[PDB]
Design a binder for this molecule. Structure first.
Ligand SMILES: [K+]
Ligand SMILES: [K+]
Ligand SMILES: [K+]
Ligand SMILES: [K+]
Ligand SMILES: [K+]
Ligand SMILES: [K+]
Ligand SMILES: [K+]
Ligand SMILES: [K+]
Ligand SMILES: [Zn+2]
Ligand SMILES: [Zn+2]
Lengths: 426, 426
C-alpha cells in the first residue's frame, strides 16, 4: 500500500476529503477533514503568535505580472508559477501567488522601519497556487493548490543565527514532540540546498549566505546532507526532510536565507546610527504544505488520530437503544461534551469554551455491531452505557489504543479529562 | 467626512490596512487589521458550528469554466465574475469563485444523501473574487476580493421557514445585539429582492418561491421593502440593508431561496418513503463582505472598538520610566495579560488560553504625552502606575469611554476582568 492509497482509504473511511476534475489538483475538505485542517492551523497560529513572536497578516491572492517581475519570480520561478490572463477586453496578466515573499516586502515597505522592531516577523496562512503537471499530482503531497504557514522574518546580521535557531525550535516542536511519526532519533534530516544554476544577485554574497547557513548547521548538531543546486533563486535554504514508511523522502518545512529580495524592493531600515541598511530576510514554513503534512500524519497513524485532532473524539453507545434510563444518561453526556447552544435564544457562543466531537449511536443495530463500527472509524474513546452504568451513574469509557483496561467516570470527570487531553495536544 | 474617509483615517491611525496598485481592489491586512479580521471570523465560526448547526468545509478557489456553465453563473453572472485563461500553451478557462454555491453542490452530490441529515448546512469562510470596475472601488465596501461567511443549507419544503427564521436569528445576534450601530429599532431593514429579468427555471416555481419568502417576511414582523428585479438568477432573496451615518444603504447579509441550482446539478436525497427528491437550497451570509462589515463598524465607532475586538486592548504607563519599582509592576502585568511563552523551551502554547493585546509605553517622553498617544489610538483601557500604585500594589485602570471614574485593581483582578469582557463580547 502506498501513502496516497493509505490517505485515500482513511479519507473514505472518515469522510475527510474529496476531489473533482473541475478543479484538478485542489482538495475539498469535507466537514471531518476541515476539522483536522482547522485544528492544525489553530495550533500553529498559537505557537507563532504567542511563543515565537510572529504577527499574522492577510494578503491578496492575485498580483499583477509586474510584482512577479520585480521579485524575480516571473522568470526564475516561471514553470511552477500559476500564470493567467483575464478574459475581459483588456487582458491583464496575473500570477496566483505561489508564495508570500513579495507581498510581505510590500508590507515591510509600507511603513518606515527601525532597528527597534527587528526581527520583524510576519506569518501568513493563505492558499498558495502552483501549476504543475497532471501526471505529477498525488494525493495530498502534490497539489496545484495548498495551504502553508508562510512566514518571513526581517532581521539584522547578528540576529540571523538566533532567528534560525528559533525556527528550528518550532520545527522540532512539530516533528519531534507534538506528533508521532514512523531512522535517526529525529523524524527528519536537513537538506543543505545550495545555489541553483539560475540565481539572482552577487556570487560573493551567495558564498557568504551559504557560509552562515553551514555554520548554523554545524552548531545545531543536527544531521544534514548536501543538496546541490536546490536552493531558491534568491538564496540557499535548510529543507526539512521527512521519510515515508516506504522510505521515500519529502520536504515538509524550510528555512531560507535571503540577501537578494530586499535589494530588488529597495528595502531599508534605520539602524542604531541613523544610517539606512538592507534587512536580511528569512523565509520560513513549518508545515510547508498543510495538506502534505496531513498525508504524512496519515502515513504514520493510518487514521488513528490523537484525541485533540480526531474528528471522531468519542462515541456514546447505549446497550439497549430502547432503554430510557440508558438513553438519558447517554444524551446527558453528549450535550455536556458537545457544549452547544440552542438557536432559539439570543445567547451567543462565548470565546474559548470547550467543544468535543462526540457522537451518539442509537441506531437500531446490535450493540456489538455499533461498537465494531466505532472501532473502524477510529474513535479515540468508546463510551458504553448499560444497566450497571445507569445504576452507578458512571460511564464505562476506554481509549481506542488500550486493549483491556477502562475507566468508570462521572460526567464531570470525562469533561475535565477531555479538556486535559486536548488542552495539551494528546 | 465620508465612510471611506473615516475607514482610511482609522486605518492610518491604528495601522489596520493597506492597498497596492499591483493588486487593485484587494486589501492587505496589517497585523492590527488582521487581529480584528480574525476575531470576527472566530466569533462567527463559533455561532455557526456550536449554535446554528453548521459544518464548515474548505473548497478550491478556482474552477473550470464548465462548472460555471453547469451552475449558470458563467452567463447569468458574467459581468461580476472574475474570468481568466491560463497563459500556458493549453489555455484553459477559469473563474475565480465569486461564491460557493456550485462547489457546495459538488459536495452535496459526493455522498448519498438521506432525509435523516436534513437540513444539511455547510459554511465556508473563503476569499471570493468579483471583477468590478476601478471607478467602483471604494474603501472596504467595494472590492475585487473579499471574505464572506458563505453558507448553504439543503432542506425539505417543511423546513424552509424554520431554517430562514434561524438565519434571521443569527443576523439579529450580529446586527441587533453584539455590535452597536448609529432609524427604526432594528439596525437594518429587509429588501424583498424579486425575480430578475434574467432568471433560470420555471415561472410558476419562481412565483411559489416568492410566495413562501413573503409569507416568512410577514410572519417575522420585520419591516421590509419591495426590491424589484434584484433577486439572484436562481432565486429571490431577503437582503439585509444597513444604513450609513450619511443615510446611504448597504447590503450586509442575505438569505436566498433556491429551487433551481439543485435541478441543474441533479441533486437528490432519499425521503421518508425511499423515493428520491430535490432538496431546496438556502444561500446565506451574515457578514456578507467581512471587509464591508468592518467598514460599517468603523462608520459607527470611529475607531473606538469594543474591548474584545480591539487590537489595542490596554496600554500600561509608568509615571517615571526610570523607576524600577514602577517598571517591575508594569512588566509583571504585561506578561500576565499577554500570557506568552518563551521560544527557548519545547513547551507549546496550549489551546484556549487567554491572550490580551496590551502594550507598555516606556518611551522617554512626558507621561502626559504618552497618555495622549494612547487616547488617540483608542486603547480600551489606560493602566497607569505611579508611586502610590506601587505602594498599594494595585493598578490604576480606567476605561476609554468613562471620563472620570476608575478602578484600583490587582493583577489577578485585571486578568479576570478582561476574561469576562472578551469571553462575552464586550
Ligand atoms: K548588527
Ligand atoms: K516559501
Ligand atoms: K443486542
Ligand atoms: K475504575
Ligand atoms: K416534507
Ligand atoms: K451568496
Ligand atoms: K514628566
Ligand atoms: K476603587
Ligand atoms: Zn518566501
Ligand atoms: Zn450561494
Amino acid at each position: 500500500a502506498t501513502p496516497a492509497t493509505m490517505t485515500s482509504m482513511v479519507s473514505q473511511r472518515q469522510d475527510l476529503f474529496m476531489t473533482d476534475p473541475l478543479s484538478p489538483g485542489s482538495m475539498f475538505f469535507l466537514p471531518n477533514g476541515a476539522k483536522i485542517f482547522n485544528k492544525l492551523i489553530e495550533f500553529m497560529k498559537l505557537q507563532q503568535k504567542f511563543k515565537f513572536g510572529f504577527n499574522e497578516v492577510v494578503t491578496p491572492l492575485i498580483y499583477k505580472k509586474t510584482l512577479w517581475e520585480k521579485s524575480g519570480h516571473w522568470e526564475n520561478y516561471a514553470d511552477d508559477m500559476f500564470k493567467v490572463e483575464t478574459t475581459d477586453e483588456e487582458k491583464e496578466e496575473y500570477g496566483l501567488k505561489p508564495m508570500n515573499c513579495p507581498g510581505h516586502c510590500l508590507i515591510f515597505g509600507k511603513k518606515d522601519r527601525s532597528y527597534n522592531e527587528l526581527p520583524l516577523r510576519f506569518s501568513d496562512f493563505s492558499p498558495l497556487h502552483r501549476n504543475e503537471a497532471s501526471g505529477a499530482l498525488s494525493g495530498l503531497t502534490r497539489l496545484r493548490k495548498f495551504h502553508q504557514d508562510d512566514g518571513h522574518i526581517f532581521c539584522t546580521p547578528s540576529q540571523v543565527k538566533s532567528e534560525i535557531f528559533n525556527s528550528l525550535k518550532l520545527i522540532d516542536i512539530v516533528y519531534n514532540k507534538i506528533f508521532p511519526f514512523v531512522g535517526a532519533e529525529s523524524n527528519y534530516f536537513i537538506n543543505f540546498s545550495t545555489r541553483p544554476d539560475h540565481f539572482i544577485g552577487d556570487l560573493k554574497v551567495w558564498n557568504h549566505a551559504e557560509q552562515v547557513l553551514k555554520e548554523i548547521l554545524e552548531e545545531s548538531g543536527k544531521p544534514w546532507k548536501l543538496n546541490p543546486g536546490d536552493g531558491a533563486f534568491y538564496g540557499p535554504k535548510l529543507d526539512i526532510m521527512v521519510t515515508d514508511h516506504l522510505r521515500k523522502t519529502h520536504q515538509v518545512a524550510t528555512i531560507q536565507l535571503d540577501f537578494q529580495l530586499p535589494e530588488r524592493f529597495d528595502l531599508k531600515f534605520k539602524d542604531q546610527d541613523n544610517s539606512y541598511k538592507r534587512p536580511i530576510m528569512i523565509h520560513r514554513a513549518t508545515f510547508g504544505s498543510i495538506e502534505r503534512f496531513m498525508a504524512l500524519l496519515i502515513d504514520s497513524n493510518e487514521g488513528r488520530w490523537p484525541f485533540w485532532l480526531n474528528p471522531y473524539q468519542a462515541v456514546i453507545i447505549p446497550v439497549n437503544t430502547k432503554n430510557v434510563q440508558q438513553l438519558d444518561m447517554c444524551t446527558a453526556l453528549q450535550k455536556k461534551l458537545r457544549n452547544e447552544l440552542e438557536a432559539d435564544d439570543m445567547e451567543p457562543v462565548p470565546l474559548n469554551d470547550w467543544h468535543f466531537n462526540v457522537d451518539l449511536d442509537i441506531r437500531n443495530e446490535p450493540v456489538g455491531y455499533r461498537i465494531k463500527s466505532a472501532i473502524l472509524k477510529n474513535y479515540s474513546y468508546l463510551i458504553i452505557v448499560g444497566d450497571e452504568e445507569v445504576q452507578l451513574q458512571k460511564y464505562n469509557i476506554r481509549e481506542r489504543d488500550n486493549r483491556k483496561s477502562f475507566e468508570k467516570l462521572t460526567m464531570s470527570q470525562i469533561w475535565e479529562k477531555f479538556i486535559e487531553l486536548e488542552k495539551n495536544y494528546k
